[PDB]
Amino acid sequence: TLRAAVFDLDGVLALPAVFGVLGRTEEALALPRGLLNDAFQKGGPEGATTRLMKGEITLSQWIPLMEENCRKCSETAKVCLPKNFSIKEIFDKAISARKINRPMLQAALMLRKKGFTTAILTNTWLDDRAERDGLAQLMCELKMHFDFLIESCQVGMVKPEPQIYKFLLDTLKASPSEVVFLDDIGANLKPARDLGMVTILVQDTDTALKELEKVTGIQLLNTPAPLPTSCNPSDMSHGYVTVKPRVRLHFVELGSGPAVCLCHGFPESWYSWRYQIPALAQAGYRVLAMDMKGYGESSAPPEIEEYCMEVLCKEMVTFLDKLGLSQAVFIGHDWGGMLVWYMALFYPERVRAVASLNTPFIPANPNMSPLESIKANPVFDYQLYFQEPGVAEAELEQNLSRTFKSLFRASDESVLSMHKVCEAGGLFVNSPEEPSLSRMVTEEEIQFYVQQFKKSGFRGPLNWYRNMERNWKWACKSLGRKILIPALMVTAEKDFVLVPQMSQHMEDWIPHLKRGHIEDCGHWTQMDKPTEVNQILIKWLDSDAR
Amino acid sequence: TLRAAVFDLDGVLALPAVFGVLGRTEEALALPRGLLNDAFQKGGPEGATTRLMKGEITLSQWIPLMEENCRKCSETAKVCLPKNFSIKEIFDKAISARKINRPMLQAALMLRKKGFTTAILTNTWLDDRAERDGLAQLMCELKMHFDFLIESCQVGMVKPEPQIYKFLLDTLKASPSEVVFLDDIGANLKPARDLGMVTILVQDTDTALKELEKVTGIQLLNTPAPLPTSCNPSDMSHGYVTVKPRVRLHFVELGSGPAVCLCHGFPESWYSWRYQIPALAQAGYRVLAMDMKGYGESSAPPEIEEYCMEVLCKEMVTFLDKLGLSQAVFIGHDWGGMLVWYMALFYPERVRAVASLNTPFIPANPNMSPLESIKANPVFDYQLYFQEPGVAEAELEQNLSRTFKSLFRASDESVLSMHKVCEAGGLFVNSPEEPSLSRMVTEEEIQFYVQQFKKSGFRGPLNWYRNMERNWKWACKSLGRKILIPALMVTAEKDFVLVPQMSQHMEDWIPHLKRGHIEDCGHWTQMDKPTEVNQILIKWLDSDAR
Numbered sequence A, B: 001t002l003r004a005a006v007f008d009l010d011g012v013l014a015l016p017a018v019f020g021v022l023g024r025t026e027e028a029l030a031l032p033r034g035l036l037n038d039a040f041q042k043g044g045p046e047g048a049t050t051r052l053m054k055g056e057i058t059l060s061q062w063i064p065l066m067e068e069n070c071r072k073c074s075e076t077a078k079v080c081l082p083k084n085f086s087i088k089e090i091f092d093k094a095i096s097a098r099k100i101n102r103p104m105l106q107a108a109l110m111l112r113k114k115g116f117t118t119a120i121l122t123n124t125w126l127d128d129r130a131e132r133d134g135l136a137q138l139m140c141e142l143k144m145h146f147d148f149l150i151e152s153c154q155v156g157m158v159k160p161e162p163q164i165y166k167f168l169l170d171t172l173k174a175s176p177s178e179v180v181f182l183d184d185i186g187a188n189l190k191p192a193r194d195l196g197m198v199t200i201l202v203q204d205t206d207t208a209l210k211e212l213e214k215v216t217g218i219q220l221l222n223t224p225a226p227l228p229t230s231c232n233p234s235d236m237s238h239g240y241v242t243v244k245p246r247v248r249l250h251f252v253e254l255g256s257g258p259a260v261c262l263c264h265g266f267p268e269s270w271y272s273w274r275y276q277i278p279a280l281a282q283a284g285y286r287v288l289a290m291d292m293k294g295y296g297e298s299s300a301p302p303e304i305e306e307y308c309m310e311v312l313c314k315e316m317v318t319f320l321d322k323l324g325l326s327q328a329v330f331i332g333h334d335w336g337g338m339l340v341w342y343m344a345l346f347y348p349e350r351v352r353a354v355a356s357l358n359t360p361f362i363p364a365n366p367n368m369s370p371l372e373s374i375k376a377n378p379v380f381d382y383q384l385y386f387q388e389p390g391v392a393e394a395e396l397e398q399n400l401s402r403t404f405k406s407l408f409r410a411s412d413e414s415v416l417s418m419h420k421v422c423e424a425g426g427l428f429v430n431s432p433e434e435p436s437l438s439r440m441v442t443e444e445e446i447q448f449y450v451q452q453f454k455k456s457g458f459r460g461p462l463n464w465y466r467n468m469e470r471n472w473k474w475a476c477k478s479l480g481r482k483i484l485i486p487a488l489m490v491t492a493e494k495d496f497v498l499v500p501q502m503s504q505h506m507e508d509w510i511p512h513l514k515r516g517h518i519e520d521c522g523h524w525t526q527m528d529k530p531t532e533v534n535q536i537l538i539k540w541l542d543s544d545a546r
């Protein structure tokens, strides 16, 4: 019974194979067949390439040695190498051209999802080339998806020597018959088979995965489109910044590049961005996924005025100040989406670009009190229920698991009615005590929110709704302004609170506004359609945010 | 009795004045004198410029209005503007050319050091230009040095209206006669004087500072070279990363740009880099100042093997992995300097560039046991004293304030003798119970280290010395390698443990090695000569690390 899968890197998890460039170079340069592949392997176990692979020497120390073996090979074949002939140039573009074999990674990801232990076992080098970062990024993107990465150069052993196989088995704490091993080199597969491991000789991925699925008994080929990579909270880098005495802000941080500040809505978490954090970091950005004031590990002062938009925006500027950031791209959802428009209106020098999911930008009406505006829309009744301090807190805090299970539901899942909430007496009065689990969340993801909400409750969160008049007066000061920095409005077809239609007049105030639209998407945009959100955000970031 | 100083931005804290570009443009373009300065002020309090300054409209909305006022002005003067005439282009290079008036900032910094409340009061705009980040950075660099920044556009008031002055006094919680106010515009100085404030009309800085020093009674002109900006620990962004169960790493984080990982020595802190963190962040880098394993807020496991170089380096790689960083520039001092050379030998793909203060790179000797090598140098006797678990811990932990006061001393300050430590019975046996305070540290900076060392003590720190044989065997595996990535060796003339001479053969293993050398500098390089360290590091980072 198999319980472990081992993958080679070159020609297995990464394509095209760097080994296959020696033959391509021979054909392109009209050199004798195998001249380059022979100079690569010259001296066998005592040769330059083995020393490189065992970590005895670095890639740059090897470059001149390989060059020497190429001349000795050409001397015997009675040939000549081009005068442009450069080993560095050949391996530079070869390593650069090498990309993840996505179907192979998906099969490994599926095997790990089914309880398998996964490992990468590779014959690799210590790369000290000026261009090494490309390969460092590739290794980073791959390794995160596996239980173990065994590199020949770090363990001082190489395939096909049988010590690395015994090292692999000891790392896996597994008997050879419990292990599938995939390699593109027949010779490196031989000792794994001789020990009794299930072995697959990989040429094309499709045949390889058919063999892999037949042996494990798991469907890996033709499987549905998987979800983007999520976050495990304990594996994240956690940041804390004091913005004023007794007010600290928490954030999760991933990646390098321009700063991208993620701002959740009500009643959420930094964790609401779990599907966007790995994807945006991989896309070349420094992600700062906030716990907004009143939530999770951020401070939750009890005073209502601490949650007005002017105070919240000032604190986000101080947050940038304390982190030494002149700007950040601000991406908000729901209440966070509202804050991001106000960051762009009041602090344009600090905002590199602004993006909102579901929340439209609507200028304040100076001729109508915000409470008259709230009454003018029946879907906004729940906001009047939220006004009285302690009333919504008692209902929302009574049973936390029921709260998140009733709220976090997709469009198909008997979504919570928002009409006549005040008349009915509460938000969940016509709701089951034990609601079913939405297709959007696992039981574990629901418990994370339950755990987060145990620290401060719903007072701080509900206080974001208790400054309608304060926010209105502040917003009226910006009525002559236009948003002329890069901006993106993303609408969700089936959000019945923040309807796409509410955003139709935005171009009057944001003339250069760019749009995104998600079909069959409810209010919880990020977890409802993460693949589409990620696609729209990355496309907009690379074109308008840099 | 003065207790507050207020500075204008344009023509006071920042030079050249953006106002003075209208006249320079008139002279360059041969336009009538004051044509541009008149179109700028057209309509006075009801005009475009006032609306911009009150925050009613943004800089980009103002650009076309100013252009219109320029045509109306040229129409009356019976002239014509160039066909290349662009208000955006004029203000773009003007704002860009504007830099901090360093002598003025130094006087403000000195006034704040003498207990004065400092403030910036400026007539400014909401900048939404594509090039706004330049000014955002300038505002960031300046603001950090002041108690308050009052921008006209954020408060909806402008100088010379007397409401902003009454707003200034209320912010300062000060009577007009307790306040010095510096402005380059005579008109904006008038209401501050009329209220009874001490006022200075700034033309050239020198005359202005003579007036400023005569009135406060504080020497601001011809004063000695000040120290670089330091860090206040409570004002920092604090990061935490779990690298394995029960081992978490703490770091302080400041800036944006390429990642620069700072690695302290024994018995130190992230705080040992206090003078480098603001300077490197300002230089265009993302600083990660570590609490190395065993120190401060990082975990301190008790086992000796947890502190061997192989385990420490593996954890630093995991740290990069969890933060989503493919590479970082690694800068180490003392024991941190030793770790950085090993990060470069074993993980070159993860290290963008390597720099060491005082610690030389010396290949392991396979023909001599590390303990024989330690005995071969009398200055290394203290390391043998450090071997026995609990012995150095008891002495180092007995009185913490005495520990840091005896250790942290400059070359001129009766430095602790390192010879015959084992014979004498301890490190401080010939040392006073109450040592004097070194010129390098304040009493408060000593107490920060005392506080940090109260959590875990010296077991974890001393364990870095208890793996001599383990480290030696691991290092012997790298004897065939060369360091061929960017590298910098900084020697300290008066470090009598890590002497400059010990680094002389480095070019045999690091042929492209770059050097730095600090004269009259002891072991505690960073706090002894921070200005010189900062100068050497920034110069090397901008040329070799990017």
Ligand SMILES: O=C(Nc1ccccc1)Nc1ccccc1
Pocket: A266, A267, A334, A335, A338, A359, A407, A497
């Ligand atoms: O109240 C919500 N959004 C808010 C965003 C700012 C403007 C006004 C609307 N969402 C709420 C989330 C929980 C229940 C359903 C709607």
Ligand SMILES: O=C(Nc1ccccc1)Nc1ccccc1
Pocket: B266, B267, B334, B335, B338, B359, B407, B497
């Ligand atoms: O031991 C020290 N440095 C160490 C760095 C690694 C190689 C061997 C030397 N410094 C020590 C700091 C406190 C007392 C004086 C020296």
